[PDB]
Amino acid sequence: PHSMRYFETAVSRPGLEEPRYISVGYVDNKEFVRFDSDAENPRYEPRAPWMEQEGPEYWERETQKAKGQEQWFRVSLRNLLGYYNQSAGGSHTLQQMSGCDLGSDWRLLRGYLQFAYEGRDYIALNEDLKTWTAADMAAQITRRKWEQSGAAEHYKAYLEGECVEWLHRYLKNGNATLLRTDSPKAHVTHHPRSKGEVTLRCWALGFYPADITLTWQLNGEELTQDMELVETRPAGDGTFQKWASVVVPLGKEQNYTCRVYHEGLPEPLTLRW
């Protein structure tokens, strides 16, 4: 279910500085390219090792594409103050997400093209890659301008064409890399947390991708009662972390057992305190 996305953001802030434009591209949810109008030398930059295989011609051109995207966002950003009759005093955000999903047959599985203004859905190209969905009065105007302009039809091209032609190409150069993983390292920590009850916290660290499941089972019957969890979070080195806890009667801690499910494992982890 490989995929590629390009997250674009343009934020305008109170001041003399022209708005800032940032663009981040992904391949299977992995960042591989980036562009920040704030960089000393604005240019798209490699973000994945497998991208270093591309030559200058690739970067010069994409950076020129970013430059344009920037004016586009800049101009659009301007038009929005208009549709919304907003006072030229403050800051606003305009986001875009586009890209394409690739089926098993290397065929375009689906395309995406949607924008959000102030973090809320604005305009969006429907799955038929033919029609639009505007979210409020303002977007109706954009929608029309585009239907009349014949825009949908030109994004469809990209989604069905270039987005695919390259995504596969990228996957090609970075299959080894993208395909890699880092199993989790786990262990349980004891914790006072009561005078009769104790807290067991099963830790999973250094794993990648971020997907993972952690269970707590007392002789068979997995537990869900008094079980805590935490949003999976970045360690700051590429991998991720996560833990789950369960309230357990004292002098019984060793009865409960924790298991850790991850694709990196050749077999799920099974440990206790």
Binding site: Q69, S149, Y158, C163
Partner: peptide, 9 residues
């Protein structure tokens, strides 16, 4: 490779 927007909003 990145999309290239067409008509502005």
């Amino acid at each position: 490779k990145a999309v290239y927007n067409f008509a502005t909003m």
